Amino acid sequence: LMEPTLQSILSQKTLRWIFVGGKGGVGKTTTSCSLAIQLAKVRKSVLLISTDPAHNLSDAFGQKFGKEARLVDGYSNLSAMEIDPNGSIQDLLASQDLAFSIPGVDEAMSFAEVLKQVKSLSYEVIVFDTAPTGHTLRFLQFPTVLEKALAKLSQLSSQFSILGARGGLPGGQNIDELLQKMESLRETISEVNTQFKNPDMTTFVCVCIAEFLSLYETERMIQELTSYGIDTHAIVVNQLLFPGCEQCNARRKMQKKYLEQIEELYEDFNVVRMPLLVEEVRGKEKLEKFSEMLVHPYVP
Amino acid sequence: LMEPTLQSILSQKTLRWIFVGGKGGVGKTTTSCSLAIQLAKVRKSVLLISTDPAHNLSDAFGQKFGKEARLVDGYSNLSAMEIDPNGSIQDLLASQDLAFSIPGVDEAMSFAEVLKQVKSLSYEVIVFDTAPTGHTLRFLQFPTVLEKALAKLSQLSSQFSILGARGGLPGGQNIDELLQKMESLRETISEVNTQFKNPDMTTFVCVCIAEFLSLYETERMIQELTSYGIDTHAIVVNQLLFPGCEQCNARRKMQKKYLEQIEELYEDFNVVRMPLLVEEVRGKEKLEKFSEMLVHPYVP
Numbered sequence A, B: 001l002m003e004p005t006l007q008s009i010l011s012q013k014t015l016r017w018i019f020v021g022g023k024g025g026v027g028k029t030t031t032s033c034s035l036a037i038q039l040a041k042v043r044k045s046v047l048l049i050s051t052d053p054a055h056n057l058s059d060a061f062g063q064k065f066g067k068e069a070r071l072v073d074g075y076s077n078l079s080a081m082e083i084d085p086n087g088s089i090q091d092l093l094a095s096q097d098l099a100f101s102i103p104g105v106d107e108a109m110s111f112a113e114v115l116k117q118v119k120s121l122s123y124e125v126i127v128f129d130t131a132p133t134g135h136t137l138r139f140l141q142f143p144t145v146l147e148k149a150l151a152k153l154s155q156l157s158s159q160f161s162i163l164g165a166r167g168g169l170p171g172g173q174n175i176d177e178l179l180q181k182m183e184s185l186r187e188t189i190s191e192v193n194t195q196f197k198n199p200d201m202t203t204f205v206c207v208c209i210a211e212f213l214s215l216y217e218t219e220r221m222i223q224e225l226t227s228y229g230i231d232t233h234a235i236v237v238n239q240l241l242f243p244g245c246e247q248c249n250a251r252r253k254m255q256k257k258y259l260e261q262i263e264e265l266y267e268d269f270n271v272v273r274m275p276l277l278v279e280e281v282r283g284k285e286k287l288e289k290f291s292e293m294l295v296h297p298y299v300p
């Protein structure tokens, strides 16, 4: 058996990267925070980075976060930052909606620079608030993007005096000097990428509603994940109804059906069940109470 | 303003093609049948054709339908058929998931033949039960597919004796004989296609749940429809909850949010509201009862 709990994850002290993803307002952001909070109780320090363009990480903790890692107010070991994509005009010029799917060299480089920073901070574990868009796993092309750049750059190093200062490239670029930045970012990117592909160090937590369109987008994201080689073994099924009002009962009979499907398809998964709450899960005190149900199965 | 009723549509006696689309088990099939049943009351005769691979058109009426138009059991002017796609091995050989998105010449031709049949029957109006897949509007490529064929076919017809029957093509294809079937299938496809692009003659009715993923997939499918120039001005919002049980009330508060969004975006639309019923809408009597609500807004 595999209990309906994220306990197996919280207990892993070798985990360094924990992704949280889910498409279409199923409560991905709420789960990212809840998982982070519950991790602060067990790990030395927890960094919460967000690739999400809505930056709901703020509206959630009701506190403004930037590209600088700040401390989540009610905590001492929990910190959060919001990463900016930083795609360039060049990035764009270099490229139905899969037309903007491949990252540019400038965007990939910027992310590598942020991972560099993050490593310096020496945060114990990192909860990765993924983007609930079409490009959830876009950052997984950064290794191949930088390698292709490092290659086209080295192939150019072979194209190289009396002329002195006037004898350099027009535009001022220093090839052997960029070949360093590029090699250094590529190495940083590759370290983290092979960490991602290590089940002992990196796992992916799916969030979903018990509707069709969500259950679908979920199996579709787990396929993509399994292809890239990123471990996933936990599904959080959010906004569930639990047992004098008839029509509300019918809506629950349907949940039971979708819920049986999930329990069948993902037998090998922890399937965590969260109840729809009556108020928004916004406060820190509310996020706490909500987070408890990630480790202690809810009961009426 | 625009009342929450499909009444405006049932009143258009110039309508010949009425599409029903909706992705993800939101009650598309049920709407297609309901809309036809309501149409049979006002129009001389109604044909219900289905591109939906699931052929839920049977499970809905509890009656087996084929590629031959049969009469729906409890009716006298309502008939249903289920179109088979008929993609060939060639078709496949000639080609993410947008890899099988362009139809083959053999599939396009087959559908043209069916449209040909259907025009012979002289049904007053047709309800078009679309496929709730990623290929909902796939048939709209048939004109361009057949035109490219008729072209490549005509070009070979300029590159073609004392050889007698030995002077034929190998394969036995008769070019001038095919240039006819192809011209005739193109002409049937074009007729029907320029009808689709006529608001007086063709409109598209969308079906959806009040969830995000569906409200999204809906604005997405309307965009594509508008691009192809196919008229759309009605949304059916299915499975809604209506006003001692607290947690169900919360689930309704969320619907209210989604429903307000819909009323705002689709101000120019008829936004029909359907309740979640306690039993499946399967029987003919149950479909009738459901279909009445497409023209008489539901109240507690």
Ligand SMILES: Nc1ncnc2c1ncn2[C@@H]1O[C@H](COP(=O)(O)OP(=O)(O)O)[C@@H](O)[C@H]1O
Pocket: A022, A023, A024, A025, A026, A027, A028, A029, A030, A031, A056, A132, A238, A239, A240, A274, A275, A276, A277, A278, A279, A280, A281, A282
């Ligand atoms: N189990 C739940 N019960 C009640 N409200 C919830 C629940 N999960 C999420 N919410 C609320 O619904 C919205 C979900 O937003 P969020 O958690 O950010 O999902 P996403 O980040 O995917 O949009 C937020 O207002 C959140 O407070």
Ligand SMILES: Nc1ncnc2c1ncn2[C@@H]1O[C@H](COP(=O)(O)OP(=O)(O)O)[C@@H](O)[C@H]1O
Pocket: B022, B023, B024, B025, B026, B027, B028, B029, B030, B031, B056, B132, B238, B239, B240, B274, B275, B276, B277, B278, B279, B280, B281, B282
């Ligand atoms: N408003 C409703 N109330 C209760 N049950 C419904 C309603 N709409 C659809 N259903 C049932 O839910 C399922 C919807 O299936 P269907 O109508 O075929 O949608 P789709 O064709 O998109 O799958 C069917 O069992 C149908 O009987």
